[PDB]
PDB file of C-alpha atoms in Angstrom:
ATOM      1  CA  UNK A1173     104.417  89.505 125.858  1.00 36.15           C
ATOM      2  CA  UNK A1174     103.921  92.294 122.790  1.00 33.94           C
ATOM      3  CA  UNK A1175     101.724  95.083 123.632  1.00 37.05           C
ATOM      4  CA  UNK A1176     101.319  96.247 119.896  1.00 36.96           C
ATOM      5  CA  UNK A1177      99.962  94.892 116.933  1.00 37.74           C
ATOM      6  CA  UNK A1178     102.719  91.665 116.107  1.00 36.55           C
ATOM      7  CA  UNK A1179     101.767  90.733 112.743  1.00 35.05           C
ATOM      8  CA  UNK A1180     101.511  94.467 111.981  1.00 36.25           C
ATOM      9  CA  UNK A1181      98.174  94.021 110.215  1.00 37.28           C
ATOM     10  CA  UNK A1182      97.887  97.892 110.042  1.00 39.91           C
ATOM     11  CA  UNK A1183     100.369  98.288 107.873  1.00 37.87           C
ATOM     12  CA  UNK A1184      98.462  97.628 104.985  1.00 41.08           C
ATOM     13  CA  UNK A1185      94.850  97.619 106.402  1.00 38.08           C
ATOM     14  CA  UNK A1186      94.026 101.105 104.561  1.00 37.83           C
ATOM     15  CA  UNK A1187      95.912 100.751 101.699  1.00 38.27           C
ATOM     16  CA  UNK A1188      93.740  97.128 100.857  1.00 37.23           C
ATOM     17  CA  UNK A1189      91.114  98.986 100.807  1.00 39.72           C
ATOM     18  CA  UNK A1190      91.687 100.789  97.588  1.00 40.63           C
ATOM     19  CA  UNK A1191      93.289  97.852  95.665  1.00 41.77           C
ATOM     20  CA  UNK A1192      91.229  96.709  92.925  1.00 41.67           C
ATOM     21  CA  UNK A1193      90.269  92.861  93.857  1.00 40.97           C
ATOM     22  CA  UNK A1194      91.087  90.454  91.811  1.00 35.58           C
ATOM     23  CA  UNK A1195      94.645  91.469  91.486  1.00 37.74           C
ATOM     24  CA  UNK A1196      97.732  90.898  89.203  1.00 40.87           C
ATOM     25  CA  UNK A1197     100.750  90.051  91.552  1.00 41.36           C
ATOM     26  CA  UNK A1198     101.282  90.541  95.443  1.00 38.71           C
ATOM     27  CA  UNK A1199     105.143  90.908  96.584  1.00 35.23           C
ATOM     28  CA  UNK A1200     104.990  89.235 100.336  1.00 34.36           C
ATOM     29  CA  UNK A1201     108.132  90.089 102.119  1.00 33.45           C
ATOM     30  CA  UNK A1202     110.612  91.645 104.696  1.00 34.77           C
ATOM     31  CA  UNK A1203     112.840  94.803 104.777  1.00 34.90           C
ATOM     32  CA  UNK A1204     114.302  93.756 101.433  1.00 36.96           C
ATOM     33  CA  UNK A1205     110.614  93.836  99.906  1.00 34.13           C
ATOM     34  CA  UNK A1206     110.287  97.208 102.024  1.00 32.71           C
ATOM     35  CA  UNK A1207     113.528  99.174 100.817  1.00 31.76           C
ATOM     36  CA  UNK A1208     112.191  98.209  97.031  1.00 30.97           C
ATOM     37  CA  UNK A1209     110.077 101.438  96.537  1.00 32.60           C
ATOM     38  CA  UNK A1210     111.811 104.283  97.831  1.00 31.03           C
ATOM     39  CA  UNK A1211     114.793 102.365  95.416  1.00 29.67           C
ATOM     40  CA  UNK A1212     112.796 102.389  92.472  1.00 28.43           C
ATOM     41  CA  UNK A1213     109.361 104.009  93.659  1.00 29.09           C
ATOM     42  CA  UNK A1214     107.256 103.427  90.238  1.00 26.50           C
ATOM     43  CA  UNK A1215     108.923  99.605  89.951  1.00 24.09           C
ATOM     44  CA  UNK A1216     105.495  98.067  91.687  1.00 21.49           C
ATOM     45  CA  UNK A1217     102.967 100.953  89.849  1.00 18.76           C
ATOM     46  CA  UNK A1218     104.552 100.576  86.272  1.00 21.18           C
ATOM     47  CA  UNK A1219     104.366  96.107  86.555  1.00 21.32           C
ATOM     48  CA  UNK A1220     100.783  96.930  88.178  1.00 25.08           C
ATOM     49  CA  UNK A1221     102.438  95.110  91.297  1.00 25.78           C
ATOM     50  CA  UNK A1222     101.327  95.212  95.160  1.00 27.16           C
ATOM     51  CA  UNK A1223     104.012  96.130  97.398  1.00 29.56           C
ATOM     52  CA  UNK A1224     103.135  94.574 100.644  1.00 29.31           C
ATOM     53  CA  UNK A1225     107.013  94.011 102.632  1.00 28.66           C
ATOM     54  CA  UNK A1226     107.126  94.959 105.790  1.00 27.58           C
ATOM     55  CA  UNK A1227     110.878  95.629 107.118  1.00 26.00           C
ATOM     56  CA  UNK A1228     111.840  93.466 109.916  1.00 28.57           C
ATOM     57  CA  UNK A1229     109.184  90.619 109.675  1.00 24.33           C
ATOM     58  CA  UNK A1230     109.802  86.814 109.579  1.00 21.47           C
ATOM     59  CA  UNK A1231     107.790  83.979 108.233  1.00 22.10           C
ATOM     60  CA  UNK A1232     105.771  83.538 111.532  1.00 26.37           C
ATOM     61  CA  UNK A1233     104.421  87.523 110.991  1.00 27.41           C
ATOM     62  CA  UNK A1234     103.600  86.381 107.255  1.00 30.69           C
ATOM     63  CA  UNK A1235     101.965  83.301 107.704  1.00 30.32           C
ATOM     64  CA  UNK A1236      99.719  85.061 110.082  1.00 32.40           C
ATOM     65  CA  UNK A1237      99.547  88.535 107.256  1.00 31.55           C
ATOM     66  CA  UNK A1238      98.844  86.274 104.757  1.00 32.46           C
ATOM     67  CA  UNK A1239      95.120  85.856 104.570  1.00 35.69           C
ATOM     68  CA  UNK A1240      95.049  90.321 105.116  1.00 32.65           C
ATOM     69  CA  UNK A1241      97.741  91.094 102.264  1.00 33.16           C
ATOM     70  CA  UNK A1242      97.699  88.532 100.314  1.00 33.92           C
ATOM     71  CA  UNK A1243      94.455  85.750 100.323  1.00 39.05           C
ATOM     72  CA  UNK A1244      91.406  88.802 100.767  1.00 37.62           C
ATOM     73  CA  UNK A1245      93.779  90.505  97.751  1.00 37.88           C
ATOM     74  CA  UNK A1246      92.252  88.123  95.159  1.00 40.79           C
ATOM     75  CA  UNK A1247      96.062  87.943  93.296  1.00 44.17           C
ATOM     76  CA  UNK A1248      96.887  86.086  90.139  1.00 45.74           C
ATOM     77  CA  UNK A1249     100.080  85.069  91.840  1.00 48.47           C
ATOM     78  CA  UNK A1250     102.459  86.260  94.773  1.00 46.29           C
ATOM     79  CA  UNK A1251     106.023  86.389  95.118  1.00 49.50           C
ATOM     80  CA  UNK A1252     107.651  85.264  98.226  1.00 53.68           C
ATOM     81  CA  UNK A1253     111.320  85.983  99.707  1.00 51.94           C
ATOM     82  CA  UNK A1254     111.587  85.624 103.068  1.00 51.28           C
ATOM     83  CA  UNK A1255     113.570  83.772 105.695  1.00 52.37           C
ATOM     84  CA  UNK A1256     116.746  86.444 106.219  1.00 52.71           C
ATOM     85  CA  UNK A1257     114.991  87.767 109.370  1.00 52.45           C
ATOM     86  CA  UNK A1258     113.891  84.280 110.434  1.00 52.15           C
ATOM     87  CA  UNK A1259     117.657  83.508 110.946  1.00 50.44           C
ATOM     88  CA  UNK A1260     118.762  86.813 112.163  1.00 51.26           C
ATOM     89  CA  UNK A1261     116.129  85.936 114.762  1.00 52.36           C
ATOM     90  CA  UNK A1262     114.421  88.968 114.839  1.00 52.77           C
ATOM     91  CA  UNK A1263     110.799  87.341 116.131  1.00 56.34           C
ATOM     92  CA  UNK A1264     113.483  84.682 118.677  1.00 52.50           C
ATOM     93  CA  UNK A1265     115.360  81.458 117.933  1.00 52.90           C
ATOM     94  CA  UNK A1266     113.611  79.622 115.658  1.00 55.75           C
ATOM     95  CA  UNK A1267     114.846  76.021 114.255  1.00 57.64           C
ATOM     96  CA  UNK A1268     115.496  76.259 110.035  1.00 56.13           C
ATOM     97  CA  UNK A1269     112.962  73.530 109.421  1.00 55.46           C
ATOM     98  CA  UNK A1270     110.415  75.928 110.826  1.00 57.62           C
ATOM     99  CA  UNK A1271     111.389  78.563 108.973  1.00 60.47           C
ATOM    100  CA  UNK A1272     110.800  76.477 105.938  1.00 59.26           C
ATOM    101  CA  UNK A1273     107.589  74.998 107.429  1.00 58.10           C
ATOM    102  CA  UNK A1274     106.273  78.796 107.680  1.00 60.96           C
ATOM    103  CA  UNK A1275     106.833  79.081 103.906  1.00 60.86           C
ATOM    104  CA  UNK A1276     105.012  75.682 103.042  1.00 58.30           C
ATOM    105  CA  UNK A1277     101.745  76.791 105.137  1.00 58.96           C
ATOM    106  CA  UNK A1278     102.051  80.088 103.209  1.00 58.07           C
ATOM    107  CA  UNK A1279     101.817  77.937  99.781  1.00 52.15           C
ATOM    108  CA  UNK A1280      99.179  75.796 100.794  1.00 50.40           C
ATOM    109  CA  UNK A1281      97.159  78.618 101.775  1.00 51.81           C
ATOM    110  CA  UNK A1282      97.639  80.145  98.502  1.00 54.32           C
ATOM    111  CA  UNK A1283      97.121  76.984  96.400  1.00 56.65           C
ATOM    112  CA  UNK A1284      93.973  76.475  98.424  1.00 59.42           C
ATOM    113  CA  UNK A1285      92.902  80.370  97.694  1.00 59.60           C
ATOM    114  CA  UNK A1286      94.121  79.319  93.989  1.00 57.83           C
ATOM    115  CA  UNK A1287      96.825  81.513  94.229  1.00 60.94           C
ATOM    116  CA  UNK A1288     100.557  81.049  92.215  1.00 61.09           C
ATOM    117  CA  UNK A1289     103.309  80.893  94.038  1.00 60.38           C
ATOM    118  CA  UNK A1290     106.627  82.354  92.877  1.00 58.09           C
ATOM    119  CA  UNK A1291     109.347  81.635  95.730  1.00 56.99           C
ATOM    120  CA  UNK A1292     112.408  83.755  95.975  1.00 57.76           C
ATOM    121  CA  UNK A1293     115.670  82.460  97.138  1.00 54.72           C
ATOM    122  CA  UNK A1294     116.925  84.030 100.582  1.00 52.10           C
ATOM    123  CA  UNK A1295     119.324  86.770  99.003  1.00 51.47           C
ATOM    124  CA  UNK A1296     123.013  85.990 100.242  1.00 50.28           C
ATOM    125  CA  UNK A1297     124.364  87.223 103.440  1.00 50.68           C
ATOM    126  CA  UNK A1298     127.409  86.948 104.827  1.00 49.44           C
ATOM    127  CA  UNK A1299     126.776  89.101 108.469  1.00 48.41           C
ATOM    128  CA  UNK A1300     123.860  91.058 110.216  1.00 49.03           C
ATOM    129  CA  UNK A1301     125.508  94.474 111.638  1.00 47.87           C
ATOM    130  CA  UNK A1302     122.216  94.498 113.833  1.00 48.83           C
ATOM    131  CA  UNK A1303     122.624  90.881 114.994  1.00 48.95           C
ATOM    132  CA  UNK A1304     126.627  89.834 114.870  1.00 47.35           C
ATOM    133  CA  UNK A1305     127.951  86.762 114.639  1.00 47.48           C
ATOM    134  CA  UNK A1306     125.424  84.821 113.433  1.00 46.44           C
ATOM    135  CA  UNK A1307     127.096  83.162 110.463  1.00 47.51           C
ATOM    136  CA  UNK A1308     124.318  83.366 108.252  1.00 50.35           C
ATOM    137  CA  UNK A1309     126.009  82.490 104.629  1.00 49.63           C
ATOM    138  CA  UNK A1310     125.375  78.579 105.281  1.00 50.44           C
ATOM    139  CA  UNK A1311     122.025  78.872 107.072  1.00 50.81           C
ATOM    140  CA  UNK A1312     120.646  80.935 104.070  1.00 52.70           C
ATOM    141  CA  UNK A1313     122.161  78.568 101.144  1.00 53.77           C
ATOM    142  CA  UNK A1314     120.718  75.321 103.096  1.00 54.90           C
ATOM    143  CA  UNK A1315     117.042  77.343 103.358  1.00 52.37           C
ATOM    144  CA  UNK A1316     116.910  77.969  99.874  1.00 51.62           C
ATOM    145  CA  UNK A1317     118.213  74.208  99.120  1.00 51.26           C
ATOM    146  CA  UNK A1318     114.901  73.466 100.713  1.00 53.83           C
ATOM    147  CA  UNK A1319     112.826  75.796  99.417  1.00 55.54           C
ATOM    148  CA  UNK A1320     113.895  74.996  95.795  1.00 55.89           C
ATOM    149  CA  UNK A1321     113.368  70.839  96.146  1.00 53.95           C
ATOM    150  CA  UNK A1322     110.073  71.731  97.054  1.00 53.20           C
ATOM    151  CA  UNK A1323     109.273  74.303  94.167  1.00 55.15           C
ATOM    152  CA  UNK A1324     110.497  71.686  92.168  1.00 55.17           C
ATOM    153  CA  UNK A1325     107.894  69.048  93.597  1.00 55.44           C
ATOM    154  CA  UNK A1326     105.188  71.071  93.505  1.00 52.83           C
ATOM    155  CA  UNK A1327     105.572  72.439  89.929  1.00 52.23           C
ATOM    156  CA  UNK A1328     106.149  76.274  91.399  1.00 51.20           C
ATOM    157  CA  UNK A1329     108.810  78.854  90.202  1.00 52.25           C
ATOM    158  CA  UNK A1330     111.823  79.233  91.806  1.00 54.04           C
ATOM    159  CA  UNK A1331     113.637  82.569  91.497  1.00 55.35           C
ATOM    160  CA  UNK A1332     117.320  82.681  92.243  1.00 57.61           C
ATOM    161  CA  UNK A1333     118.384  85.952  93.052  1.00 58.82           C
ATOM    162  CA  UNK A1334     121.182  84.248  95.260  1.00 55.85           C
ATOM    163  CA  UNK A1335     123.773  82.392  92.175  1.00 57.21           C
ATOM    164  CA  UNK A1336     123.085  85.890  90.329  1.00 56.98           C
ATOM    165  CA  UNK A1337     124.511  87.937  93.236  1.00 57.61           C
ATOM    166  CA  UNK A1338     126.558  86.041  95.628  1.00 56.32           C
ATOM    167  CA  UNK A1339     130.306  86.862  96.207  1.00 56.01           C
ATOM    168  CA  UNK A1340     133.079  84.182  96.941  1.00 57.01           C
ATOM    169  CA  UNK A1341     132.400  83.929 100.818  1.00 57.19           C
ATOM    170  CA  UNK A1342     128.182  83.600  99.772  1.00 56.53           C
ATOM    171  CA  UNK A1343     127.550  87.006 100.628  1.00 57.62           C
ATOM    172  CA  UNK A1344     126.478  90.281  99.162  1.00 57.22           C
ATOM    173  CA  UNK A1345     129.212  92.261  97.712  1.00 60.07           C
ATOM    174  CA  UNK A1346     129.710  96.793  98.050  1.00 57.99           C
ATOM    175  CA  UNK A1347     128.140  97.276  95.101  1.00 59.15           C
ATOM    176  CA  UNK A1348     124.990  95.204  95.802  1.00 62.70           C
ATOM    177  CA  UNK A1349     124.484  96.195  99.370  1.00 63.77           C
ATOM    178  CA  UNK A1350     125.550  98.908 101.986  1.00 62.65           C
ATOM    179  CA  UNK A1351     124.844  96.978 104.777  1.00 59.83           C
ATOM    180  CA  UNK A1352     125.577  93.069 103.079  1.00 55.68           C
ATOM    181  CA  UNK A1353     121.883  92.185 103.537  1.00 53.12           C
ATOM    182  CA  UNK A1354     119.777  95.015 101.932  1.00 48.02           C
ATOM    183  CA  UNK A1355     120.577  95.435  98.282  1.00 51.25           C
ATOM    184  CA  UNK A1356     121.191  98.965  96.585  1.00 50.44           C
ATOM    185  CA  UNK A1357     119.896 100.243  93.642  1.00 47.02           C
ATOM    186  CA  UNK A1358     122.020  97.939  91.407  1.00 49.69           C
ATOM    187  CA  UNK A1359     121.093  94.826  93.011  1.00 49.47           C
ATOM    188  CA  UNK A1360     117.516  95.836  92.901  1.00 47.58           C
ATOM    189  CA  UNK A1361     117.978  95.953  88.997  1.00 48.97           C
ATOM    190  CA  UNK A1362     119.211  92.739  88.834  1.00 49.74           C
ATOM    191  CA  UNK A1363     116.024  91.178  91.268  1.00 51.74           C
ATOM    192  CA  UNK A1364     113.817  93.278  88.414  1.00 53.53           C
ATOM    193  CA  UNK A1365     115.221  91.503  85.759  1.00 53.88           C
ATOM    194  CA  UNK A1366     115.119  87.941  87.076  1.00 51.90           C
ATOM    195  CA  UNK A1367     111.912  88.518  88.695  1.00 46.75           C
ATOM    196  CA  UNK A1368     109.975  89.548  85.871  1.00 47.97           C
ATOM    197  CA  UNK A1369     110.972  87.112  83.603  1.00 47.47           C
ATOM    198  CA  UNK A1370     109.944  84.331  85.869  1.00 49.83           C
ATOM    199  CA  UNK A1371     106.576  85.870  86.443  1.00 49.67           C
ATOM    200  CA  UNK A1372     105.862  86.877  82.604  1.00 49.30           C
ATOM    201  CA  UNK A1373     106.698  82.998  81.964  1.00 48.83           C
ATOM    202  CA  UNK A1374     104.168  81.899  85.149  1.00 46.91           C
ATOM    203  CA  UNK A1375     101.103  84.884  85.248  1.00 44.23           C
ATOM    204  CA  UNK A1376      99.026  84.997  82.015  1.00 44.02           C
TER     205      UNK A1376
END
């Protein structure tokens, strides 16, 4: 099995430590979450934002992060996206329903912890160069079908970074991404913009 620390609750375990409790809004996510501050370094400081993505991680890691970097965190609200790494398989084959299932513990938790929840749609993907072959374009718009019916349902905000940045074969374009996964600057400007407006219309 691992030898490490899985969930990678070090991370972040300093770092909580100095956050003033109760906070504003917690950003819970993967490598996309991750490659957000050395993008745009002051975007989490200047929105009084906590950064806590961790590159690589799928739901199961978060779920199990959750109650560290997000619950003991006190936050008004936290954003979700996750889910990409879930179906490049990156902690083994796990079914979709799962995925989402991962995502729906991590709402109840926060609902119980009386906690917003702002869910992100899966950004679009076309390939993984790490994982080829995978065909996740389909996998990622039938996720965030899922994840959006239940935002809906349960009266939380559903942010769609995918219809703002999808190409014609429902991945990222150039522009957007080097690596069609991992946006660039420019597609980090357009998550800003969406983003914000959906929590300025949710946090008080």
């Amino acid at each position: 099995g691992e030898k490490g620390d899985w969930a990678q609750f070090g991370r972040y375990a300093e770092a909580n430590k100095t956050v003033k409790v109760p906070s504003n809004v917690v950003f819970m996510g993967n490598s996309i979450t991750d490659g957000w501050w050395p993008a745009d370094s002051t975007f989490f400081i200047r929105n009084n934002f906590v950064d806590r993505g961790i590159s690589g991680q799928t739901t199961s890691e978060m779920l199990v992060r959750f109650r560290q970097d997000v619950i003991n965190l006190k936050p008004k609200a936290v954003v979700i996206l996750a889910g990409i790494n879930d179906i490049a398989h990156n902690n083994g084959v796990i079914a979709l329903e799962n995925v989402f299932g991962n995502l729906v513990s991590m709402a109840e938790l926060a609902k119980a912890n009386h906690i917003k929840v702002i869910f992100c749609s899966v950004l679009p993907a076309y390939d993984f160069p790490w994982r080829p072959g995978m065909q996740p374009a389909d996998k990622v718009i039938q996720l965030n079908k899922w994840i959006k019916e239940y935002a809906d349902k349960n009266g939380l905000t559903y942010v769609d970074y995918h219809s703002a940045m999808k190409d014609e074969r429902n991945g990222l374009p150039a522009n957007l991404s080097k690596d069609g996964v991992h946006p660039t600057l420019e597609g980090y400007k357009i998550m800003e913009k969406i983003v914000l407006e959906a929590i300025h219309k949710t946090v008080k």
